[PDB]
Amino acid sequence: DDHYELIVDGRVYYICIVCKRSYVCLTSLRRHFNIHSWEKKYPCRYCEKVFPLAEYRTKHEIHHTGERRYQCLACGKSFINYQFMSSHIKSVHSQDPSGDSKLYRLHPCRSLQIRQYAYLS
Template sequence: YPCAVCHRSYVTLSSLKRHSNVHSWRRQYPCRFCDKVFALAEYRTKHELWHTGERRYQCALCGDAFLTYYSLKSHQKGAHG
């Protein structure tokens, strides 16, 4: 299901509908730390992690923690093969 505005593709129609809020003018979830406002609460929550430095993704092999899932996977591939 491609987005008509930005052309990103989604696996389900419900995901596309949720994404469409990003392009609406109804941005109702302000960041508690800066002036950014988000269309979805989950986007705001992920953004706020950059302000707090909270590291939610922990490596099961060594215990190091990371801000993003991508960073964790990159670490695991590089450090643990």
């Protein structure tokens, strides 16, 4: 088909037949394989760009609307994505958002319609 399996320590891995990338979950291998097959297109609704993963397109479109969902809870500045927020917090506040404390807020996406995680409230 589109993958084969490898088993080490009863550990199951799924191997893409084209690039031979490894995945713990088959849904991940299938998500990745569209990159090769393009059986599904994810077109930007704001311009003409096409993406092989839905999440790639979503990040892209958020870039179109200018919405800033990531907010530093130390000083209030907002950022378009995780990386800007994290960079800001590390440089300006000398802290790490992947540590123990909660240092940023991710607001619900409001500038466009995507699935909404209830915990973002």
